[PDB]
Amino acid sequence: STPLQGIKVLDFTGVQSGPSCTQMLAWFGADVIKIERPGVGDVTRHQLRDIPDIDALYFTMLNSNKRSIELNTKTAEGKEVMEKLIREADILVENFHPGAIDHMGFTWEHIQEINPRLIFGSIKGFDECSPYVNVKAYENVAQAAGGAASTTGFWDGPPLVSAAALGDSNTGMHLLIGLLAALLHREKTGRGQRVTMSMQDAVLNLCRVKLRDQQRLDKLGYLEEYPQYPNGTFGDAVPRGGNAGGGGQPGWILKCKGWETDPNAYIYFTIQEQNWENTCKAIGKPEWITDPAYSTAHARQPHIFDIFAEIEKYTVTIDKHEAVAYLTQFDIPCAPVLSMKEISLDPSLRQSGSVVEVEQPLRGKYLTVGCPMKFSAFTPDIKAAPLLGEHTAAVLQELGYSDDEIAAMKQNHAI
Amino acid sequence: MSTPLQGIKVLDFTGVQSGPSCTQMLAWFGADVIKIERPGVGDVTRHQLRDIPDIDALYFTMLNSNKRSIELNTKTAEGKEVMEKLIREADILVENFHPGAIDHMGFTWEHIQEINPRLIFGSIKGFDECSPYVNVKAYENVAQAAGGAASTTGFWDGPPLVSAAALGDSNTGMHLLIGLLAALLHREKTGRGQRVTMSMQDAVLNLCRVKLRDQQRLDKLGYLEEYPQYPNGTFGDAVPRGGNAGGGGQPGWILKCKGWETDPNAYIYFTIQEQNWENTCKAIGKPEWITDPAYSTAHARQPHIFDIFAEIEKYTVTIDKHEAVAYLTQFDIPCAPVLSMKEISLDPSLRQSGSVVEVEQPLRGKYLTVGCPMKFSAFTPDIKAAPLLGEHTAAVLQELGYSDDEIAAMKQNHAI
Numbered sequence: 001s002t003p004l005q006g007i008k009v010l011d012f013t014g015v016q017s018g019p020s021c022t023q024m025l026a027w028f029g030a031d032v033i034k035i036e037r038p039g040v041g042d043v044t045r046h047q048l049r050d051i052p053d054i055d056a057l058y059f060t061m062l063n064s065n066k067r068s069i070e071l072n073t074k075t076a077e078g079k080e081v082m083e084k085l086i087r088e089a090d091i092l093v094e095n096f097h098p099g100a101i102d103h104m105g106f107t108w109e110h111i112q113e114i115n116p117r118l119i120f121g122s123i124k125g126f127d128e129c130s131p132y133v134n135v136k137a138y139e140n141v142a143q144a145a146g147g148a149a150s151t152t153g154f155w156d157g158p159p160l161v162s163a164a165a166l167g168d169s170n171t172g173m174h175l176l177i178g179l180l181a182a183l184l185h186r187e188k189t190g191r192g193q194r195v196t197m198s199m200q201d202a203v204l205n206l207c208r209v210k211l212r213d214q215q216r217l218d219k220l221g222y223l224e225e226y227p228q229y230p231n232g233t234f235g236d237a238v239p240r241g242g243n244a245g246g247g248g249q250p251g252w253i254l255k256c257k258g259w260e261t262d263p264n265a266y267i268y269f270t271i272q273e274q275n276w277e278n279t280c281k282a283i284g285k286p287e288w289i290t291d292p293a294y295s296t297a298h299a300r301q302p303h304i305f306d307i308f309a310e311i312e313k314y315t316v317t318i319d320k321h322e323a324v325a326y327l328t329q330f331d332i333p334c335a336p337v338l339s340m341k342e343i344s345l346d347p348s349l350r351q352s353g354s355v356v357e358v359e360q361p362l363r364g365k366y367l368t369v370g371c372p373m374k375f376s377a378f379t380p381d382i383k384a385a386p387l388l389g390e391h392t393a394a395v396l397q398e399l400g401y402s403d404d405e406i407a408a409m410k411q412n413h414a415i
Numbered sequence: 416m417s418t419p420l421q422g423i424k425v426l427d428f429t430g431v432q433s434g435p436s437c438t439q440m441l442a443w444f445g446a447d448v449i450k451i452e453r454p455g456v457g458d459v460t461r462h463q464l465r466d467i468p469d470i471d472a473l474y475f476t477m478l479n480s481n482k483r484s485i486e487l488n489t490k491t492a493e494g495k496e497v498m499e500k501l502i503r504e505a506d507i508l509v510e511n512f513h514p515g516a517i518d519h520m521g522f523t524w525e526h527i528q529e530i531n532p533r534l535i536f537g538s539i540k541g542f543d544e545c546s547p548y549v550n551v552k553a554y555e556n557v558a559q560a561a562g563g564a565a566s567t568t569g570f571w572d573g574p575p576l577v578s579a580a581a582l583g584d585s586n587t588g589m590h591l592l593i594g595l596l597a598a599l600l601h602r603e604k605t606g607r608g609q610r611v612t613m614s615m616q617d618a619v620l621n622l623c624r625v626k627l628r629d630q631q632r633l634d635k636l637g638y639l640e641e642y643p644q645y646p647n648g649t650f651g652d653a654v655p656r657g658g659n660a661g662g663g664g665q666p667g668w669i670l671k672c673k674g675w676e677t678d679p680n681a682y683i684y685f686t687i688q689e690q691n692w693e694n695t696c697k698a699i700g701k702p703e704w705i706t707d708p709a710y711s712t713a714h715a716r717q718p719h720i721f722d723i724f725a726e727i728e729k730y731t732v733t734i735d736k737h738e739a740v741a742y743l744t745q746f747d748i749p750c751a752p753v754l755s756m757k758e759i760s761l762d763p764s765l766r767q768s769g770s771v772v773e774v775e776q777p778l779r780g781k782y783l784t785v786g787c788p789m790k791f792s793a794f795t796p797d798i799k800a801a802p803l804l805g806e807h808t809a810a811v812l813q814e815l816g817y818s819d820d821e822i823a824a825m826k827q828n829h830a831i
């Protein structure tokens with residue numbers, strides 16, 4: 001068995017936020033029916049193609065294990081099919097621009113009459129209450145609005161976006177939590193419900209510790225662990241802190257051998273509070289262990305960049321991998337800045353099922369990020385992403401449509 | 416009637432941020448969450464970066480709302496027995512201790528199963544069990560380094576950069592939460608618990624799926640057509656940093672608005688949406704660019720896209736970010752202000768949506784927390800104070816069936 005065996009999902013989503021969510025649902029065992037615009041399909045099929053005329057990697061990495069139907073829900077037949085699908089499904093997911101699904105006639109209120117057991121998941125850029133409620137949102141728009149860009153980067157540089165999908169995949173993961181909770185809830189109420197998740201909120205959730213800092217800053221007028229303390233200045237808003245420890249312990253990104261030509265010849269190095277002695281032994285500074293300018297976090301802070309400068313006299317003489325292999329003997333929390341190339345070839349990520357080679361029709365092999373959490377009682381089986389409308393006939397037949405009904409839909413551009 | 420996890424009992428061994436974010440959500444969903452804490456010490460976040468002397472820090476109160484706290488030393492004969500009885504009565508056990516730590520207490524996953532075959536065991540670590548870094552301690556930024564985020568965040572002429580967002584911590588907690596919910600759904604069918612593990616490296620990698628897409632494109636082709644480096648810069652063998660480029664979204668950049676020279680947040684993100692070129696040109700008074708073949712497609716714009724962004728900035732710098740956005744959105748341009756944490760903390764709509772929540776804590780009074788991020792039509796989480804250390808020890812022990820003599824003996828023996 002799988003966790004979602006028997007669950008039926010209607011997947012209206014496109015791009016990244018919505019499809020990351022329903023991809024996971026499929027991996028957990030749900031039957032995920034991707035509803036696509038006839039002749040067009042999810043925009044990621046044509047975005048940044050690396051092989052001419054076939055589905056792009058953006059699409060294949062987000063749509064493994066799904067089924068694809070072409071269905072134009074703005075036709076009379078399409079709306080009826082859509083209604084039959086809602087009637088038989090457990091879950092409906094959409095991440096269209098605000099209004100979009102409503103204007104098809106498929107608003108929450110109509111959905112409940114058709115299927116009171118259905119769980120409706122909706123992703124938007126912004127909440128119902130927001131002044132930005134009808135604003136279209138892409139990844140970095142949510143990063144700006146959710147507090148991440150404000151607090152990421154350097155104090156003497158611009159706001160900076162994160163490479164990580166804080167707005168897209170992160171939001172899809174947050175809706176997934178809601179959908180799972182809603183399934184557990186339905187076990188008790190006998191009812192579906194609506195779950196919404198905004199991109200702004202998904203970003204904000206991950207910046208909880210910066211909202212901690214803002215309150216500290218409001219009360220006190222300073223942040224004792226930030227690079228600006230005590231010889232710089234604070235304004236009224238949490239500032240950017242470069243490569244400071246954030247939610248972790250004090251740390252920095254340090255150069256290792258190769259840095260002048262290799263943009264990834266670096267480590268993250270943590271000065272953990274209780275590990276100062278080991279940290280000093282590691283770098284051959286036994287005289288720093290009990291020196292009152294060095295022995296506590298509070299004393300180190302005013303000259304912490306001298307201390308990082310001193311660790312860097314060692315780290316630049318060896319490869320990041322050598323550097324880490326040594327320092328971890330001293331129980332220092334550290335790790336190489338791994339490039340996407342190193343991650344793509346890393347044997348242990350293959351073994352753990354974190355990076356998965358999948359075979360796609362026409363394309364052949366590609367790599368995807370696998371199911372990130374591991375279960376002792378089940379292993380996801382990660383498969384190819386569907387060709388556009390590959391499963392239209394089968395889905396219509398499962399609903400009870402005759403061959404004549406299907407041929408009429410095709411004639412009428414409903415599929 | 417009725418919350419999603421009503422009747423669910425959770426044993427929460429977690430400390431810091433990754434495990435506690437997970438169990439906080441479990442509590443908001445209705446679960447009874449028992450935080451097991453070291454006697455006289457508690458979760459380290461109680462003492463980290465206190466803004467008020469002698470009381471629980473905000474790091475703690477923002478991560479431990481709605482939980483119960485017991486002081487219990489599981490290294491004592493009594494503590495191990497209480498722990499066993501707690502595992503027998505619980506649905507879920509969550510831990511994020513250093514590698515080895517919970518094993519060395521005498522309830523190994525294999526031992527947990529014998530005690531309660533219905534129990535779901537959730538475990539967070541920095542790295543997976545076959546990683547060469549399996550025993551490495553991981554904080555937030557260590558996971559960001561190892562998971563590919565730091566490598567691909569920042570500028571091409573600067574260092575790797577960490578993200579402010581908790582990619583390693585709260586993100587990993589959210590990923591374990593997904594596993595725990597799925598495992599509860601799976602138990603409805605099997606009648607059995609299971610172990611769910613989540614590493615911090617994997618949580619970061621999951622959010623960088625689009626950079627793994629780019630690595631493969633780069634391996635096949637030798638270039639990334641949408642990256643700032645194309646076509647007039649150079650590519651190496653690894654996905655490079657691209658500054659404020661659109662990433663998984665459409666081409667875009669962080670642009671200066673009025674005040675930028677003194678306000679580090681006087682900026683917007685501006686997206687050039689492919690199907691919106693005409694409106695974009697109208698917005699900026701460049702009607703002549705609509706069909707100019709140097710401008711009319713994404714492919715044609717790319718070699719001189721920073722000129723285009725520079726031209727947008729001649730408008731955006733004359734006006735403040737909020738006005739810039741109210742104007743541009745009339746043209747269907749995807750944009751938003753770079754909101755500071757100050758703006759977010761005071762934002763009325765975030766209060767109205769339950770996204771920023773004012774909670775009243777004993778001794779401290781009011782604080783703000785990030786609320787339950789997704790919204791449910793059939794239920795509203797009730798977000799409460801975080802527990803004082805050991806506040807619920809007696810209650811939990813009595814629920815297990817211990818007498819007053821048994822509890823007094825535990826206290827004498829430093830088991831609580």
Ligand SMILES: CC(=O)SCCNC(=O)CCNC(=O)[C@H](O)C(C)(C)COP(=O)(O)OP(=O)(O)OC[C@H]1O[C@@H](n2cnc3c(N)ncnc32)[C@H](O)[C@@H]1OP(=O)(O)O
Nearest residue numbers: 431432433452453488489511512513516552553554555584
């Ligand atoms: C917000 C964040 O999560 S930050 C990111 C790091 N967090 C993670 O989730 C990654 C996994 N965890 C870790 O790597 C580690 O817990 C770290 C690096 C965060 C911290 O490690 P440390 O502070 O050095 O030790 P840690 O808090 O894990 O445990 C210390 C000891 O307390 C013991 N302990 C914990 N709770 C109890 C208890 N109730 N009774 C008795 N002992 C206890 C542990 O078993 C361990 O003891 P041991 O070395 O004698 O076997």
Ligand SMILES: CC(=O)SCCNC(=O)CCNC(=O)[C@H](O)C(C)(C)COP(=O)(O)OP(=O)(O)OC[C@H]1O[C@@H](n2cnc3c(N)ncnc32)[C@H](O)[C@@H]1OP(=O)(O)O
Nearest residue numbers: 015017072073095096097100124125136137138139663664
């Ligand atoms: C790369 C990233 O950053 S991903 C960010 C994703 N964003 C979200 O998830 C939040 C909500 N999404 C959005 O705001 C938007 O979908 C955007 C901005 C991402 C993209 O929007 P657009 O490309 O302008 O249009 P979108 O794909 O939403 O829909 C366009 C039309 O297709 C229609 N449509 C969708 N599926 C179908 C179908 N099966 N049959 C007929 N029409 C359909 C929609 O109803 C809409 O029509 P309408 O404007 O006449 O009402």
Ligand SMILES: O=C([O-])C(=O)[O-]
Nearest residue numbers: 225248249250297463
């Ligand atoms: O959390 C921290 O960074 C600290 O304790 O200094």
Ligand SMILES: O=C([O-])C(=O)[O-]
Nearest residue numbers: 047641661664665666
């Ligand atoms: O997705 C993109 O960035 C694109 O299509 O250029």
